[PDB]
Subunit: 192 residues, 2 copies
Amino acid sequence: DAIAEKTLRNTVTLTAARGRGKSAAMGVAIAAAVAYGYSNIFITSPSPENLKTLFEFVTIQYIRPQDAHVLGQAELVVIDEAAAIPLPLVKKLMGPYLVFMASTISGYEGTGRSLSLKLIKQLLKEITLSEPIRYAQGDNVEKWLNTLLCLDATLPRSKISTTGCPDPSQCELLHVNRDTLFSFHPVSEKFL
Amino acid sequence: DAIAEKTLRNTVTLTAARGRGKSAAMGVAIAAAVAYGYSNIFITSPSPENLKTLFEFVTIQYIRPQDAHVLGQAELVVIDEAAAIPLPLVKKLMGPYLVFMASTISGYEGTGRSLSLKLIKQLLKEITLSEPIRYAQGDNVEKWLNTLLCLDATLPRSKISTTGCPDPSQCELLHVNRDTLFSFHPVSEKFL
């Protein structure tokens, strides 16, 4: 409910891993706002992405961003995985209305969280959803893939140790080979 | 009231001389259809034309035809002096909705009735308004200008005489000079 001393119209950005319900969340707002009633909505996306869940959960109509550039009808715009969309095009569009920004992270074909921050900075009310709709948390299969795949993001904010977060000190340049991969000691799986 | 066994949605074309009230007529429908209620409307026009009366008589919003080509929101479209708009652009637009087509004729900067028929053929429910809002009919000033200016259209449908309407017979090619203008007899003011 974006109403307040601050503007009510603003940009929301919900980010989460896959299977979190970002789309489903984005679908709710569609009807929840009623054509006549709460209001009418809109939706855009990059090379398609599954538009199917959001709308199925959904007035959803879809004009892709470029074609989207045409005229301004709606009160609340929703863009699925905007991080994928060009900064220039995306920014212009966000200006004419109020938006829900969705983006997948921490998975395959997601967007790097480092880039996500730079992207957010361009604006943002950001929110995150932690639990999967399809399975229960703690699903060992999912844990397995995350660990195998190295889904985990932590370094941008901070490292988990005494150090982490900004990396202070003099920067030193050095090269290392693949072999570092096997050894587990100093220069180990960890460095790579 | 376009509702019937035939489609309710169709194209209406009201044509008339200037000062007939075409715009005012077109304005009425705007509110008469209520956003929520009868319905929402729309309006387009060529190089502008006085948009002022229609809307003042009017939800009127205006996106020019080309920019208009963007998305389809409305139940009843109105285009002011469409004859002025390109056939290609105009036709495409008429397809997506229900429309009121207005056009000025029988005056300065009006559209020739001959062309108007060809234009109509491209479709049309056409209606005409005969009396001026601003003055009483029979205003001698208006009669004067019409006659001076040669506002009168009659030849396309038919000539007022035994002959008129289609021109049958073998076509004969001949030239005549301006001088025909003065003489009033055979080859007179009439031929020119």
